[PDB]
Amino acid sequence: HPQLFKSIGVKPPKGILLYGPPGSGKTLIARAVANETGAFFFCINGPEIMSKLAGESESNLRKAFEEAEKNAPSIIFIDEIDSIAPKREKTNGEVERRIVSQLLTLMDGLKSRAHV
Amino acid sequence: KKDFSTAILERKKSPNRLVVDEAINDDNSVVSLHPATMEKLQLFRGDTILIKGKKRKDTVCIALADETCEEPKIRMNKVVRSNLRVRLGDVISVHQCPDVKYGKRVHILPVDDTVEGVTGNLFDAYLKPYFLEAYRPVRKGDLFLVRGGMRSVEFKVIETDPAEYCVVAPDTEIFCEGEPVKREDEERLDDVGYDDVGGVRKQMAQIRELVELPLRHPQLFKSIGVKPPKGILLYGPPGSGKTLIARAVANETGAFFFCINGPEIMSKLAGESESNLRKAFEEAEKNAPSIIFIDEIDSIAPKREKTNGEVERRIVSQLLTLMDGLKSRAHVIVMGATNRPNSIDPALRRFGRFDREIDIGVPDEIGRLEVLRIHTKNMKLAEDVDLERISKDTHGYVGADLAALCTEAALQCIREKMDVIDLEDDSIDAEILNSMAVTNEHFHTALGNSNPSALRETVVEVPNVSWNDIGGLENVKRELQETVQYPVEHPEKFEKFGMSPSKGVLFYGPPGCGKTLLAKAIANECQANFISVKGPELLTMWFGESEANVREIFDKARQSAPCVLFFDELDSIATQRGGGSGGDGGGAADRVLNQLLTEMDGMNAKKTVFIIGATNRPDIIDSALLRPGRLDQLIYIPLPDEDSRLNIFKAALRKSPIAKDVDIGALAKYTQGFSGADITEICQRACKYAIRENIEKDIEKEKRRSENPEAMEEDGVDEVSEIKAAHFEESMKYARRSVSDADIRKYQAFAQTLQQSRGFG
Amino acid sequence: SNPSALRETVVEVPNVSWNDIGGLENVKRELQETVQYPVEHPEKFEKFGMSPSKGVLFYGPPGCGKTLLAKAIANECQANFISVKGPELLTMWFGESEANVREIFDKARQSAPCVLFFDELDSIATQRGGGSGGDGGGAADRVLNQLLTEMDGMNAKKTVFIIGATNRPDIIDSALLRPGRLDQLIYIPLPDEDSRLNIFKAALRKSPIAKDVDIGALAKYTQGFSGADITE
Amino acid sequence: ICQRACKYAIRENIEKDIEKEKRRSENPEAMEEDGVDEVSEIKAAHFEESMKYARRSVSDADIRKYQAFAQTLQQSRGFG
Ligand SMILES: Nc1ncnc2c1ncn2[C@@H]1O[C@H](COP(=O)(O)OP(=O)(O)NP(=O)(O)O)[C@@H](O)[C@H]1O
Ligand SMILES: Nc1ncnc2c1ncn2[C@@H]1O[C@H](COP(=O)(O)OP(=O)(O)NP(=O)(O)O)[C@@H](O)[C@H]1O
Ligand SMILES: Nc1ncnc2c1ncn2[C@@H]1O[C@H](COP(=O)(O)OP(=O)(O)O)[C@@H](O)[C@H]1O
Ligand SMILES: Nc1ncnc2c1ncn2[C@@H]1O[C@H](COP(=O)(O)OP(=O)(O)O)[C@@H](O)[C@H]1O
Ligand SMILES: [Mg+2]
Ligand SMILES: [Mg+2]
C-alpha cells in the first residue's frame, strides 16, 4: 500500500537491523515475513559470500543487488553482517576493506528505491 | 556599527526586484503590477517581461496593471510562482524581454497525472482553442495548467523553436505529441536549493565567502592581491548536514560539480584508485570553474598509524601529490567532508592542502525549529501543530534525527488510523484516505518513541539564564562583572593603564549555592559562548580516547572567542599531591591535572579566553592552581541569608501558582542558613503534596459522580489549586539540611585564613 | 539440557505486588507519589512547573525489604525492570569493558519506561578520598566516573527511573547525592512488631500452619529480627 | 595591588563616561562642551580602596622555616 505514503508524504524506511541472542528466531522471522508478504525474497549468507575468492565476492554482491532491483518488489536478507562487515577497530585485509566498501556503496546507491 | 561576519547572505534593496504575493487574474502568462512600478521601470501596457527566481530558474510573463496592486509587490499567481520555485514573501527580480520571436517548431506535451482518465482529445479541445492566436509567452520546461472542461490537464513544454522561449502563435504546428511526461520529471525536484538548508547561518556564510566569491568575482581578489584559499574541510557530528550543505552551495552557484565518494573509490581494486583519482582531478581542472566534493575523506586518507597498510599508504601518497598540484589557480575548489578533525592524516592539514576548517555543529533551539519547519512543508499537518514547544523539548537532536522524528510522527498518525483500512487491498475511500492530519499528539508520541544521537557532544552554547532567578549576591555579581565583562566589552581602555587582566576565577563555598548559576549568568550577559566541562567526564574520556580530549576542549574553547570555559567539580582531580597516592587511578588523576596545568599555561597567555573553575572544598585543592595566572582570582560563595532566602524562594515559586495566605517572609524567617538546593527541594515536596491532594480530590469526585449517574454536572470545577499553607506545613516538617555546622565552620576557617586583610578594616 | 542464553539481560515486569510486603506503609505512599505519579500523570507537573526527581537511594540494615520494594513499584508502574548488581559491573569491566555500562543505559533507554535497579553499590561507590584510585582492582576510579557520566544524561529522558540500594550509607561517595544523581534518600527500617506480624503472615501465606501456633507470640519472640531471618 | 587599583580606576572611568553620555542624552540641546575626557590617572582613593582587600600570600611560619633552612648552611655566623 504505497498510496498511504504517497498521500501523507513520507519516504518509508529502507533498512531493518534485527539483533538478538544467537538462535532466537531472526532468520525464521525474516523468512516468515518474506513468505507471507509474497515478495521476491533473496538471501545473502555471511560466510558464503566471505568464503569465495577475491574479486568474486564483489561480483556476487553486485549481481545480488542488481537482481533484486530487477524484479521489484524485493528483499535482500543479508545474513550475519558481523562476518562480512565487522567493526573496524583495526584491520588490514584488502579483501575485507573492499567488500565492506562495496556493501556501503551499494547500500548508499540503493536510494533509487524501486521497492528494495 | 554592524556585525559583518554574516554580511553576504542578506539581500540588497533595488528598484529592480520586488516581493511575491497573491493576485486575482488566473491566466497562465499574466502577472499584475502597479502602474507606479511601470513608471519607475519605464514599462508600458502589454509588455512581456522576464522573471528570475530561485535556483537559477526564469520564465517570461505578460505584465498588466491594476490600482489594487501595491508598488513593492508583484501579485504573482500560484502557477507561475510554482514554476519559479518560490513562495509568498520572497524577492524576485524583473527585466524586459526584447525578443519575442513567435515560435515555429514548438513542442507541447501533457503530464501523466492529469491525463489519467482523460475526457478524450486535447488537440482540438484543450490545446488549440486556448493557445491558437492566444499569444501566450511560453518558456521551455514550464508546467502550465489548462482546462477544456472540468478536467485540468498539466502540460510540459518539451521543445521550442527558438529553444529558449517563444509565443504560441498560429504558426505553431505541433499537436499533442502522444507521449505524456511521467511524474519522474519532478522526482529530481531541482535537487537542493538554499531554503532546503537551514539552521546554520554562519557556517553557510563562511562557505559562501570561500566558494561563491572566488568563482564569481575574481576582480576583488586580483585588486587586493590576495591568494584565495582552495582547500575547505567541513566536519561535525555524523548526520548533521555536511553533504547537504556542500550540495546546496555547489548546485546554487552553477559551477561544474564533481562528487567523489570515499568507499566508492576504496571499493575498486588496487591499481585503479590511483588512476581514478588522477582522472577525476584532470577532468575537473579542464572545466574551470570546478568544485570537487570528496565525501568521507576520512575513509581514503586515514591516520597512518591506524592503518599500517601498503595500499592505503600508496593511495594517501597519491592523494597528497595530486592535492599539492592544485596550484594551477584554475578555479578548482576541494571540499573534503569528514566527522573527526583528529582522525584525518595530519599531512592533509599543511599549508596548500586542506587548511580552512569549518565546524558544522549541532543546531540550537532556533536551528531545530527551522529544520522542523523546513521538513514539515509537505506533510498534511493538522491545525494544532505547535512546533515551538516541539523544538524546545528536543535537545541533542541533529538534523537527521529531526527528519526521522517527522517521519516517525507521520507513521504514528497512519498507524492510529489502522482500524478502517483493510489488508487485502487499499483505496477503500478517497475521503477516508484524506483527513488523517498529523496533530500534536502524534508528534508527542514520536518524540517519546525516538532517541537522540548527540548527547555526548560538547554543546558550545549561549545560556539563557540571566541575572535573575539567582537572588542576592550583589557583591559577587559586581566583582564577577568587573573581572569578566569589562576586559571583553572594553579591551582598549585597559591598554591605557597597560595592565592586562587575569583570565581565571575560582569559586569555593558550601556545596550548592549557585556556583554554576553565576558563571552561566555572566556568560549570558556577556553573550560569550559557554562550555561546561566536569571532572568525571574528563576522567572517563581519558580511558575512552587516551587523553585526546583535554587539548581538544581548549581548542574548541579557543576557536569560539569570547568564551567562558567552566570546570565543575575540581575536587575529583585537583586534590593536592599527597605522598601516599598510588595506583592506576591516582596516576590517571595526576596525569589529567598535569595536562590541564600545561594547557592553561598557553591558553591563558593570550586570546582572552576566560576560565572559571568551581570546587566544593578549597583546602584540599592543589596549591599549583593558585599561582599567578591560571586560577589566581579567588571568590567565596556564601550561604544565603534571610533576604537572599526570600529572593530564592520567590525565584523558585515564580513558575507556580501560590496561595495568597502563604507568607513567604514567614518561610524566610522559618529557615536559617539552608544550602540553597534544599529550598528547591522544599518547593518540590510542596508541589508533590499539592499534586497528591488535587488528584485525590479529582478521583473522589469522579467516583462520586460515577456512583450516582443522575447527579448532573454541578458548579464544582477544578480551581487554580494554589499551593496553600497546609502543603508547606507538611513539607517543611520533613526538611533535612545538607550542610552541617562543621562544614560551614571549615569553610569559614579557610576563608579567614586567606582573608588576612581582616586587620585592614 | 541447559540454556544457552542464561547470562543475557533481564527485561520483564515482576509479579511482586504490595501484598508481598508488609509494614512499610509510609514508604509505600512515598514511593507511589515519587514514581507512579510523574509517569502516569505527567502534564500536571508542567502545570505546576517544577520537574520531579529521578532516582531514589535506599539505605537500611541488610535484608529488610529493599529489593521487594523495587519489584513492587515496578509492578505497580507496569514498567520494565532491569536489575544490575554491583559485581556484574566489575566483571563486565573486564568483559565488554568500557562500553558495557553504556550499553545497559542504552537498553534502559530503548525499553522506556523502566526502573533500573543498582544493588550492592557499596562495592563500587567507595568514597573518592585520598586513598582512592588504585589499579584494576580499584574500580571506583573507572566504573564510578562512567556511571556518573551516563547518569547525568538520563535527566533529559522523561521516564527512565533510577533506584539504588546500599547497606553502607557511610562509605557511599558524595557525588551520588548531588541533585540529578540519586537525589532522594529513603531509610528502610527493620520491621517492627506489627511489621513482623505482617511479614510472618506473608511468609507463611504459601504453606499450611498448625492450629497451635500464635503469630503474635512469635512476633514478640522475634523482636529485632530482620526479614531474611523470619524467612529463614 | 596595582592591578586592582587599575581595575577600580577603569570602573570609575567607564562610570564617568556613561554618566556624561546620559547627561548629554537628557535634553539633547546640550552641545559638545569643553568637558573632554581627562587623563584619568589612578588616584589615591583607588589605592586605598584596593589596599583594604589585598591578601597576604606568605604566613609567619614559612619565613622562619626558610630562614632555618638557610641558617643550617650558615654555620659560620659564630666566627664572623
Ligand atoms: N521464536 C521462534 N518461534 C518458532 N520457532 C522458533 C523460534 N526460534 C527458533 N525457532 C526454531 O528453532 C530452530 C532454529 O531457529 P533459527 O531461526 O534457524 O535460528 P536463528 O535464530 O536464525 N540462528 P542465529 O543466526 O544464531 O540468530 C528452527 O527449527 C526454528 O523453527
Ligand atoms: N541543517 C539542515 N538543514 C536541513 N536539513 C538538514 C540539515 N541537516 C540535516 N538535514 C537533513 O538530513 C537528511 C540527511 O542528512 P545528510 O545531510 O544527508 O547527512 P550527512 O550529515 O551528510 N551524512 P555523513 O556524510 O555520513 O556524515 C536530509 O534529508 C537533510 O534534509
Ligand atoms: N540562590 C539560588 N538561586 C537560584 N537557584 C539556586 C540558588 N541556590 C541553589 N539553587 C538551586 O540549586 C541547584 C544546585 O545548586 P548549585 O550551586 O548548582 O550546586 P553545585 O554547586 O553543586 O552545582 C541549582 O539547580 C539551583 O537551581
Ligand atoms: N515486608 C516483607 N514481606 C515479606 N518478606 C520480606 C519483607 N521484607 C523482607 N522480606 C524477606 O527478605 C528477603 C529479601 O531481602 P532483600 O530485600 O533482598 O534484602 P537485601 O537487599 O538486604 O538482600 C526475601 O526473601 C523476603 O522473604
Ligand atoms: Mg540464525
Ligand atoms: Mg557525506
UniProtKB/Swiss-Prot annotation, chain C:
It is found in: Nucleus; Cytoplasm, Cytoskeleton, Phragmoplast; Cell membrane. It comes from the Eukaryota. ATP binds at G60, P61, P62, G63, C64, G65, K66, T67, L68. Changing K66A: Abolishes ATPase activity. Coiled coil: none annotated. Disulfide bonds: none annotated. Probably functions in cell division and growth processes. Interacts with certain SNAREs as part of specialized membrane fusion events where vesicles from the same organelle fuse (homotypic fusion). Homohexamer. Interacts with SERK1, GRF6, KAPP and SYP31, but not with KNOLLE. Component of the SERK1 signaling complex, composed of KAPP, CDC48A, GRF6 or GRF7, SERK1, SERK2, SERK3/BAK1 and BRI1. Interacts with PUX1, PUX2, PUX3, PUX4, PUX5, PUX7 and PUX11 via its N-terminus. Belongs to the AAA ATPase family. This is Cell division control protein 48 homolog A. It comes from Arabidopsis thaliana. The gene is CDC48A. The chain holds residues 462 to 693 of 809 of the full protein.
